[PDB]
Amino acid sequence: PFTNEAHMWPRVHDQPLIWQLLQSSIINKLIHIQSKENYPWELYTDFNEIVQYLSGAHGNSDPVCLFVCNKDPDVPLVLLQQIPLLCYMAPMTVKLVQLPKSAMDTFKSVSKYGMLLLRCDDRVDKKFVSQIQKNVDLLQFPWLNAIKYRPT
Amino acid sequence: MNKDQAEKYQERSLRQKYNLLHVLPTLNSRALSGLYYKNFHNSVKRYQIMLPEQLKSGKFCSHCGCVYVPNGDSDELGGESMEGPKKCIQVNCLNCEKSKLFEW
Amino acid sequence: MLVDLNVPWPQNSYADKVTSQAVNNLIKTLSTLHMLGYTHIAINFTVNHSEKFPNDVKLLNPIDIKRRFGELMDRTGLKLYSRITLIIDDPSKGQSLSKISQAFDIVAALPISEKGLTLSTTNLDIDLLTFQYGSRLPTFLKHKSICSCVNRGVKLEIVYGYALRDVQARRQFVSNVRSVIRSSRSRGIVIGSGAMSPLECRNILGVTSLIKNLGLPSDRCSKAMGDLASLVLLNGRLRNKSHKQTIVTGGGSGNGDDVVNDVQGIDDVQTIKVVKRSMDAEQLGHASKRHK
RNA sequence: AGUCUCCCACCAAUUCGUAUGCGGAAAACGUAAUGAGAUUUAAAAAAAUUGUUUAAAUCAACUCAUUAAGGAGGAUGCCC
RNA sequence: AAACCAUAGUUAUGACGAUUGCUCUUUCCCGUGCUGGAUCGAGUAACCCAAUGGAGCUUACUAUUCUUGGUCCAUGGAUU
RNA sequence: AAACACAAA
Ligand SMILES: [Mg+2]
Ligand SMILES: [Mg+2]
Ligand SMILES: [Mg+2]
Ligand SMILES: [Zn+2]
């Protein structure tokens, strides 16, 4: 397939309340100040920055993770149509993650746009993503299979 | 020709065209990309079937016909870059010297 | 190369059973045609139109080239083809060519009336047009019709082997041949010998002398027996074997593996050709450089 | 050869009073310069003629859309 | 009751004989060559045919079933 | 036969 398996990645139900907890950590990090924001934690919230970080400029850290809000009406579907392809072709192990909450547009209301590119080297990032790689890992290349484009 | 056997032939031909659209050279060479794009579209126009818009919009280019792909099988990236808006968000390619603009 | 396309089979209706004497005489006449010299022989089978076609496929061909002609070819060295002539006079509803055309190789017609002639010239998919040289001609043959037919395909056939039957038939045979040659503009003429026994056969020189005495030049006779006979064999062979002239089931490598020439190799119960792998992707494209 | 077109009385004008790229009495007539086009098209595919019956890498071929005649001044390019 | 009129004119355009020329092949000479010359041979094509006259267009022809000129980002071989 | 027709096929 090309997109038939692409929008709906996750099939689990244990995370959402702890998703709320990490969102609370996000607002905790957003409270302090512009510099206190970005000094200890590797966060990007600018589409141009998302592209330039995955372009291949710096290759230091392997585990990179994106968090985007999707599959809810009236969103830039045409524009996030190309971000999973970028997350796959990127040489870094980039785990695209999708907010399964249509009501979680407060993310869109808080930082910039409803997406967040993070680089997992903090040990709490280790703690919470080493348990989510157990949970969700779904990323393929359409050029490989191309068996179910969209028949019947 | 059986129509039940013709449906399978149609699916197989569409899959074959879509696979020929891909592998190495249609990504590399703009000529083969455009030719195979035209062939696939002339083949899908004859079957009286519409194609999905979610792919129709952001699939190929308008000047050459290569798939918009940024950086199992390592290949060449399709597009020069993809900026932010900067006034309006655009996408540029490698093969040709043009860009495609979209507004929010 | 010489081709004889109207060797008659001693059977007219399906209710008839062929005795061993007729098969022995046919084997003898095939040997006779081969000894003096010949290249292609296509035996003929004649049935009428108002008869009831049997609703079979594996019983439509009482020729069995693999059974007895398979006994004869390995010692003879030539090939045989099965052809059928349709005696159609009145356009009745009996019409089942979709089976006999694919079962046989060459399909001809024998019109007696004008309406049958018109329908066989326009709609009926046939290969050769044979007239009853024994009886009288149906009408005054037109020129434009025959020219458009030979430009569209089907050509006329002249059988000099019937003039050896009796005395009273020679005048009618000559009168019909003259009209056919005058109306056909000497373009689509194919010559054949309808002999039932080896004693009524002749040499190519006797044939060309007879036809040059009839009115057709000898060089045209040689050309129509060399190229036109091969072409009318090819058309009737690949119209049934292959599709409508788009995809061929036979691949000619050298000079003997031809769809009309290669007859024992190509399967007939199906249309496949099981050959060992002889085309790879690592071999050099240029045949002058490619060496094994 | 062909089930194509037209001339084979005129009309200072209800009579194609048509100075319209050129030649021509007319013609489903010849040809010249440029741009574009392919059942997604102005129109060819799932009146006559022709077995195949324009094209669809480039060339070649078909179709359509513009360019009114003569004299004078300035600029550019060539022999000079 | 005629207007009856064709450098073919109304189902006609015959019959053979002789001469030159044209295309290839088996030969000899001067200067290489020369729509240079002479013997041994094969072929003179096809579409097809007027019925009142002229022009335009399209469609059939030329493979040992005569020929001619040019072109080709067609391929095949060789030199730079 | 040819030649003719807002025929007929
Ligand atoms: Mg005439
Ligand atoms: Mg006529
Ligand atoms: Mg006429
Ligand atoms: Zn391009």
Say if CB C22 and CB C10 are below 8 A apart. yes
- Coil/strand/helix, residue A148: coil
Whole-angstrom Cα distance, residue B83 to residue C277? 54
Handedness of CA A57, A60, A63, A69 (dihedral sign): negative
Report the C-alpha dihedral over residues C159, C164, C165, C169, rounded to 10 degrees: 70
Strand E at less than 7 A from CB of C136? no
β-bridge mates for residue B90, sequence order: B101
C144 CA distance to ligand 3 middle (Å): 15
Q: Find how far residue B21's CA is from the centre of its chain.
A: 7
Say if CB C182 and CB C174 are below 8 A apart. no
Of the candidates B15, C32, B17, B66, the residue with the CA atom closest to the CA atom of residue A151:
B15
Is B77 near chain A, with CB under 8 Å?
yes
Contacts B22 to A, Cβ<8 Å: 143, 146
Q: What is the CATH number of the domain that holds C156?
A: 3.20.20.140
C274 part of a folded domain: no
DSSP letter assigned to residue A83: H
Range of the domain at C71: 3-241
DSSP letter assigned to residue C4: E
**Min Cα–Cα distance to chain A from B96, Å:** 20
Closest nucleotide to B45, Cα to C1': D40
Question: DSSP string covering C158-216, please?
Answer: EEGGGGGS-SHHHHHHHHHHHHHHHHHTTTSEEEE---SSGGG---HHHHHHHHHHHT-
C7 CA distance to ligand 1 middle (Å): 43
Handedness of CA C278, C280, C283, C287 (dihedral sign): positive
Beta-strand relationship, B90-93 and C40-48 = unpaired
Whole-angstrom Cα distance, residue C116 to residue C126? 13
C139 CA distance to ligand 4 middle (Å): 71
SS (H, E, C) C53-122: CCCCCCCCCCCCCCCCHHHHHHHHCCEEEEEEEEECCCCCCCCCHHHHHHHCCEEEECCCCHHHHHHHHH
Range of the domain at A36: 10-147
Strand E at less than 7 A from CB of C71? no
Of the candidates C16, C93, C7, C82, the residue with the CA atom closest to the CA atom of residue C49:
C93
Whole-angstrom Cα distance, residue C270 to residue C266? 9
Handedness of CA C103, C69, C226, C211 (dihedral sign): negative
Q: Find how far residue A92's CA is from the centre of its chain.
A: 13
Q: Find how far residue C263's CA is from the centre of its chain.
A: 15
Say if CB B37 and CB B65 are below 8 A apart. yes
- CA terminus-to-terminus distance, chain C: 34
CB contact under 8 A, B72 and A77: no
Whole-angstrom Cα distance, residue C50 to residue C53? 9
Query: Helices C143-152 & C168-184, crossing angle to 10 degrees?
Result: 70
> In the complex, which subunits touch C with 3 or more CB pairs below 8 angstroms?
none
Resolution of this model in Å is 2.8
C289 part of a folded domain: no
Closest nucleotide to C227, Cα to C1': E63
Nearest CA in chain B to A152: B11
Say if CB A117 and CB A47 are below 8 A apart. no
Handedness of CA B48, B53, B54, B57 (dihedral sign): positive
Whole-angstrom Cα distance, residue A69 to residue A114? 6
Closest nucleotide to C220, Cα to C1': E65
Total domains in chain C come to: 1
C272 part of a folded domain: no
DSSP letter assigned to residue C14: T
How was this model experimentally determined?
cryo-EM
CB contact under 8 A, B54 and A77: yes
**Min Cα–Cα distance to chain A from B63, Å:** 19
Q: Which of A58, A75, A82 to mutate to test the interface with B (most CBs of B within 10 A)?
A: A82
A26 CA distance to ligand 1 middle (Å): 100
Of the candidates C99, C14, C10, C83, the residue with the CA atom closest to the CA atom of residue C48:
C14
